Design a protein around this ligand. Structure first.
Ligand SMILES: *[C@@H]1O[C@H](CO)[C@@H](O[C@@H]2O[C@H](CO[C@H]3O[C@H](CO)[C@@H](O)[C@H](O)[C@@H]3O)[C@@H](O[C@H]3O[C@H](CO)[C@@H](O)[C@H](O)[C@@H]3O)[C@H](O[C@@H]3O[C@H](CS(=O)(=O)O)[C@@H](O[C@@H]4O[C@H](CO)[C@@H](O)[C@H](O)[C@H]4O)[C@H](O)[C@H]3O)[C@H]2NC(C)=O)[C@H](O)[C@H]1NC(C)=O
Ligand SMILES: *[C@@H]1O[C@H](CO)[C@@H](O[C@@H]2O[C@H](CO[C@H]3O[C@H](CO)[C@@H](O)[C@H](O)[C@@H]3O)[C@@H](O[C@H]3O[C@H](CO)[C@@H](O)[C@H](O)[C@@H]3O)[C@H](O[C@@H]3O[C@H](CS(=O)(=O)O)[C@@H](O[C@@H]4O[C@H](CO)[C@@H](O)[C@H](O)[C@H]4O)[C@H](O)[C@H]3O)[C@H]2NC(C)=O)[C@H](O)[C@H]1NC(C)=O
Ligand SMILES: *[C@@H]1O[C@H](CO)[C@@H](O[C@@H]2O[C@H](CO[C@H]3O[C@H](CO)[C@@H](O)[C@H](O)[C@@H]3O)[C@@H](O[C@H]3O[C@H](CO)[C@@H](O)[C@H](O)[C@@H]3O)[C@H](O[C@@H]3O[C@H](CS(=O)(=O)O)[C@@H](O[C@@H]4O[C@H](CO)[C@@H](O)[C@H](O)[C@H]4O)[C@H](O)[C@H]3O)[C@H]2NC(C)=O)[C@H](O)[C@H]1NC(C)=O
Ligand SMILES: *[C@@H]1O[C@H](CO)[C@@H](O[C@@H]2O[C@H](CO[C@H]3O[C@H](CO)[C@@H](O)[C@H](O)[C@@H]3O)[C@@H](O[C@H]3O[C@H](CO)[C@@H](O)[C@H](O)[C@@H]3O)[C@H](O[C@@H]3O[C@H](CS(=O)(=O)O)[C@@H](O[C@@H]4O[C@H](CO)[C@@H](O)[C@H](O)[C@H]4O)[C@H](O)[C@H]3O)[C@H]2NC(C)=O)[C@H](O)[C@H]1NC(C)=O
Ligand SMILES: *[C@@H]1O[C@H](CO)[C@@H](O[C@@H]2O[C@H](CO[C@H]3O[C@H](CO)[C@@H](O)[C@H](O)[C@@H]3O)[C@@H](O[C@H]3O[C@H](CO)[C@@H](O)[C@H](O)[C@@H]3O)[C@H](O[C@@H]3O[C@H](CS(=O)(=O)O)[C@@H](O[C@@H]4O[C@H](CO)[C@@H](O)[C@H](O)[C@H]4O)[C@H](O)[C@H]3O)[C@H]2NC(C)=O)[C@H](O)[C@H]1NC(C)=O
Lengths: 183, 183, 183, 183, 183, 183, 183, 183, 183
């Protein structure tokens, strides 16, 4: 039995993150400063700014908006896109109708709008088109429009969960909408 | 003292490689065309396509993906398998949690997924089962999921090293998972 | 002129060979069963198992391994050693960097490793120390690590030749590493 | 009828042998110490060291070497040569291709090489040139390279016979290559 | 008492010897030039070439050959034969098995071979057939094959004695094998 | 002065000789047929077979033998003996050591041996004992053993002379050894 | 005519003979005992011992000797001499060369030698000198040396005749050599 | 009766004897000097030389010779002759065959020979012819040849007697042979 | 005295003598022819033939014979006889022993023998018997045998004398022997 072996050598280094999530990045007090409302939101950036974890409460309102719950610092101009969104709910009925995540400029103008959930299902065209972001600091906000009539009378903490993946390519040319493989 | 001598004669020739690594093999511009991102990856095929050497930077993201960093041309249908993987890191803490190397079709469908490192250790079942590859050109990609909190603030170039060996048997019948002996 | 003549009489008989090379010796189908890969190896035992002749092709891989290309039946426990190795190549540059011949057990564990060529030259300590082999059947395999960059683009059949001599002494005591004289 | 008678008187005495064959001569354990391998060689010196008789077995190997099967003690510096070699075989086909008898120094360096049989026939130039040997003790060894394919499957004890005569002249001047007359 | 007396008168003259033994006869340096090896042979022609006296030493060899120990000049073509051989030995056991005296041409071809002793006894047919010798110069040599095992360890000078008589008739017709009467 | 005269009358007649010397007597070609070797002997019977005259040449041999140089026909059984032998030599040194005259049967068996000269002197007991000869034909031969070293280099014809007298008594009773008186 | 007559008277008596011939005189068996060889001699003493008559045969021998054919008894010491010898032969050629008559002592020593015929003629000095003989008994013998070549092939009885006269004077003083007158 | 007487007167004188017998006549010692051999002859001249008386002994010899037994002196030249011879013997057989009386010269030459007895009888012609004798001295001798076989064994002194008469006429002319008358 | 005278007358005549002595009577030369030997006899007839006178010499011979000294012629037949003989000698001893006178016939036969002296004395019977003589002529001779030893050494002429008388009677009848008277 003839075997030919092919050797690949990978030497892994480390570079400052192109984009990262934070609370008040680079000392800017207007960029991510509502991640700790005592009884309604609690959002923290993941270890080393790799992501954000947010506990959110929706409260029988037609629009539940969470403004400036994290800040996104894009150190180098690159191309961002929404890679994958997963939504699972534990209630009998679907609690969330619409869910959108907004990246806004420092003055509150929407730079990119990301429709996480439309009409109770996750966005079919998951790997959205890579679009360009300039270096700077941006606000991120979340709007959730629920199905009224579904929210339980007794409060809960796991009505639903939404996981979002954002791809950033720090390249000159816009890359194809490459999806995220399962490790 | 009686001695019997047994003479073996080996006449060594040369044959075109069954599989080989390249950048854009056979002029196909969609097969290995991201081996030179200016500041994040630098991957080159070894002399005569015997392997690949890649410098990679991981950057505080939950998934660090390097798509299409080399192309694999399999000139003849054969059986491929992962033979041996070695991983050594120079940092105090383990920088890499998961590391997977994907061989994908030209359209981005995963043909074979090779888990180089799972949960910070190298894959116990090293000589994976030989599986069949048809002749053609394929993309290879690398996904590295780090331990966040371990990546140093100051950049480096030898945080870790991963060496991979792939065995290809150009035979009709699938061979046993023969390991690679030390020369 | 006085001459004294001394007469020696040698009567030559015949005994079964202590060790011999074969393909599937004694009907064991796991001992030498890869001596005929259609386009990459062709290994045959010499007349009456006195040795082996193998045409091998090396193919731009970092390790070219030829597993189970012959079987060695050692009918009686004796002492084996590598007696002499000669290597001549016809190409301008040296094609072979390392060349090792492995004698392995039926389960693929290396019993003795014989470094035919190290770093492009033949092993300086040619008459290796006689070591003991028990009666049984063993696999033999060859690993060739070439100098990449030297292999010609157009295939050939006499890139190089390696001739190996193995000495077997079928004695109770280990003999000195007796070399093989030129007839 | 006239007859003239001429009377010759020869008075025969006795002198220690100039050279003689032995096993471990003069107590030297490194000079002739392999004349009794249990199943492969049995070599004994003739009565009073006048010659050697050896039963040898050849065993399907490309070189069958019998090292140190006798010792030669040359008590006085003289001139040695090969006088006559006769070879007769009882098998249908010739079993022996090459047969050489080596006289080597105590350290295994070949002093004189005597080609008994070359390519299946006895050496045409039988009375080889007398060459000088200094007083001392020397090893003698035999190498037989058979015609593989001719050795019988069932063992035998008279496959062939080789008788060798060595002439030693204990004189200051080298004698002519005097042949051995038939008594 | 009648007595008749018959008177015979013999007048004795002298003629050059028909054949005679010598060392280098007639200045020919290739005819009898080994009658004085310092420690192994000492052969001298008898007074006036009537015969030869040789002290010989036999030395534990299977053939003890004494080449060119005397020269025979046959001035006139005649008929030679072996007349009488006597052998007496002083050792307990017979030291000599075979003893042959060779008359050879100048080029070393055997003209006549005279078996003095065969298998330890003197040749039964003592008065051998007269055979013709042409005028010229010839070599004489002696081969003694001993009984090994009989030669004493301590050297001696009268182990045995062999006396030979050669009859030469210088006549045209071959004479009958006339024996030598005791004076 | 008284004188008495005594007259004796002897009438002398003639009888066939009892014994006589001849060449081939009575037509027997085996009885005296070597009396004329061209250059070495010339023997003739005396007038009427009363004796023999022989010119003989001795030639540097240890035994000079002259076989069948005369024949003796004894017509009537009688008693023969050697009566007187005289030897005179003309050389400075004695040329003849031993000289014996043999009377042999037709088959070559010695009937009577007559030692003419022993050790250079003539036989002291000259009138040897009369011994009986039967009627028939007999060979006579002469053996001369010279003093080597005395024979001259240049040939001669009167080196020495030996005269022999044989007495034959044709009587029934053996006579006393009557000597031969000087006429 | 005056005549004077002178008368002489002789009275003749008789005395024992001083010397006489006989066969075995006085019983002595060693004195005259070969007067009757059957075919070669026949000698008888004359009547009363006055002389001897002998028929003799000469037989082609160089010396024809007739020993002890008569005995001479000399009773009284006297003086003997040869008086007259007459020789006549009937053959064409002279048959007798020498003829001598010997008077010998009892021990065979010659007392007086009488040359009857010398070289074919009778002795010129016929009346030899009277020499003294002592009383006793003596042998007489005859030697005849013939002319070989003259003796006839066919035997005869009167080839020749020799008559001898011996004078004996029985006196004290030696007489003159008185010859024998014709009666 | 007439008677006439005639007277003759003779006057007788005396003259010296013409011839006479003697012993050594006239002092000549060579003329008659053997008349006294002690035991064989005794001859004396008669008184006054008138004759001789001799006792003679004959002794078994073929000739009995008595030399010089008397001397005859013839003083005057005269004529001598034998006148009468008488022979008588006393033995049975005749003892004397021949008897001759010789008158010889002083030198032993026979002057006259007188045959007294021929063949046993006395000479028939008794008065022999007167022959002349010159004056001088002469020897006389007697030869007697007996009949052997007749002589007696015991000696005697009168075997026979012979008487002789010699007539001498001292005259100038030879007388007739006058016989001697009986007185 | 008467006387008667008687006268006788005798007339004497003369007659021729009847017998007479002579020398050569009647011319017969054979009858008396030795009467004159010069020195030994001298005989002459007496005057007229009456007798004879003879001088005779006797000479030491045993018989002294004087033959034919006279002749007797008897003219007439008558009777003769010896009448008287007288013998006288003058020597001391008798010189004559015998003396006889013979009358013989012409042929020498004795007619009558007359013994004058016998044994030294004269014949006793002197007148011998007359015997008859016939007419004729006769010889007369004298023989004298002397006494040897008596004859004188010196010669003489009258040693003795003998005278003889012969009577002749010329008558027819024989007369008586008449003696001769003295005148
Ligand atoms: C297996 O490994 C083998 C190693 O030798 C490879 O053989 C080499 O192939 C080269 C071309 O390969 C490229 O192109 C083919 C398509 O044709 C693709 O399949 C490959 O993926 C790859 O992209 C070739 O390089 C050059 O060759 C030509 C010169 O002969 C040149 O025109 C071409 O444009 C290529 O660039 C190798 O050829 C030899 O090249 C060396 C230079 S180098 O080693 O290539 O850099 C030349 O040496 C020069 O010689 C001159 C004197 O002539 C000297 O003065 C100077 O010092 C020296 O540089 C040789 O002359 C030239 O022959 C070729 N190697 C050999 C030994 O032939 C093989 O492709 C590998 N297999 C695969 C599938 O890639
Ligand atoms: C040492 O070297 C020896 C060289 O002779 C070898 O001896 C030979 O063994 C052969 C069989 O060996 C095979 O099988 C054994 C198990 O039995 C294994 O241990 C071996 O590893 C090996 O796989 C044998 O070959 C054939 O022999 C039979 C015929 O006798 C046949 O039925 C078998 O099926 C084998 O194929 C050799 O035998 C001789 O074979 C030759 C043909 S060939 O040389 O083998 O190709 C025959 O010649 C034919 O003869 C006919 C006339 O009879 C001719 O007309 C024709 O022209 C000719 O081809 C012989 O007749 C036949 O005897 C056998 N060699 C000898 C000389 O006996 C030995 O095995 C070696 N040692 C080892 C351990 O392998
Ligand atoms: C040339 O050929 C010669 C042939 O005779 C050799 O002579 C023999 O040497 C023997 C010893 O040689 C060995 O040792 C020497 C060192 O000393 C080495 O150089 C040699 O290479 C060799 O290894 C000798 O054998 C024995 O001799 C001793 C007895 O005398 C004994 O103590 C020793 O230990 C040896 O074993 C030969 O001696 C004779 O030996 C025979 C027995 S045998 O023939 O050796 O086997 C004895 O016969 C015995 O006698 C008894 C009565 O005594 C009998 O009852 C019995 O039946 C019988 O066996 C002899 O008695 C004994 O003398 C010796 N041969 C002779 C004739 O002396 C010579 O070595 C050769 N040359 C070389 C260089 O090797
Ligand atoms: C047959 O046997 C014969 C025996 O006599 C031999 O005769 C002798 O030949 C000798 C020479 O022979 C050699 O040379 C010839 C070639 O010429 C070869 O064919 C022969 O093979 C052989 O090699 C000869 O010896 C010497 O002779 C010369 C002197 O005459 C001398 O110059 C030479 O150089 C030789 O060396 C024999 O001659 C006699 O020699 C003795 C000495 S010896 O006996 O030779 O050693 C001399 O005696 C000396 O005399 C002196 C007084 O003169 C004394 O004072 C002294 O004491 C004494 O030594 C003689 O004088 C000398 O004549 C010669 N022998 C005779 C008797 O002549 C013959 O060669 C034999 N046949 C063959 C074919 O070889
Ligand atoms: C000298 O010559 C003489 C010649 O007569 C020799 O005298 C004869 O001697 C005879 C014996 O001589 C032998 O013996 C003596 C020793 O005694 C030796 O010395 C001799 O050498 C010799 O050998 C003698 O012969 C025989 O005599 C005996 C008889 O008397 C007799 O017994 C003996 O045995 C002898 O044989 C001669 O004697 C006479 O012999 C004749 C016979 S014959 O003549 O001898 O043959 C007899 O005649 C016979 O007589 C009878 C009548 O009686 C007749 O009837 C018959 O016809 C007749 O034969 C005589 O009677 C006898 O006397 C003897 N001769 C004489 C005459 O006496 C003498 O020996 C010589 N000298 C020497 C030294 O030998």
């Amino acid at each position: 039995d003839v075997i030919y072996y092919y050797q690949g050598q990978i030497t892994v280094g480390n570079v400052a993150p192109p984009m990262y999530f934070a609370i008040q990045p680079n000392g800017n007090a207007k960029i991510g400063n509502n991640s700790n409302v005592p009884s309604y939101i609690n959002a923290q950036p993941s270890s080393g700014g790799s992501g954000f974890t947010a506990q959110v409460n929706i409260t029988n309102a037609t629009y539940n908006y969470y403004f400036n719950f994290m800040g996104l610092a894009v150190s180098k101009t690159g191309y961002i896109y929404l890679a994958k969104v997963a939504y699972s709910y534990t209630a009998t009925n679907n609690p969330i109708q619409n869910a959108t995540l907004y990246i806004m400029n420092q003055q509150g103008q929407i730079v990119y709008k990301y429709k996480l959930i439309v009409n109770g299902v996750v966005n079919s065209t998951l790997p959205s088109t890579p679009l360009q972001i300039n270096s700077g600091s941006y606000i991120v906000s979340l709007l959730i429009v629920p199905y009224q009539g579904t929210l339980p009378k007794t409060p809960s903490n796991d009505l639903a969960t939404i996981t979002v993946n954002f791809g950033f390519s720090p390249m000159t040319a816009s890359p194809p909408p490459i999806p995220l493989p399962s490790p």
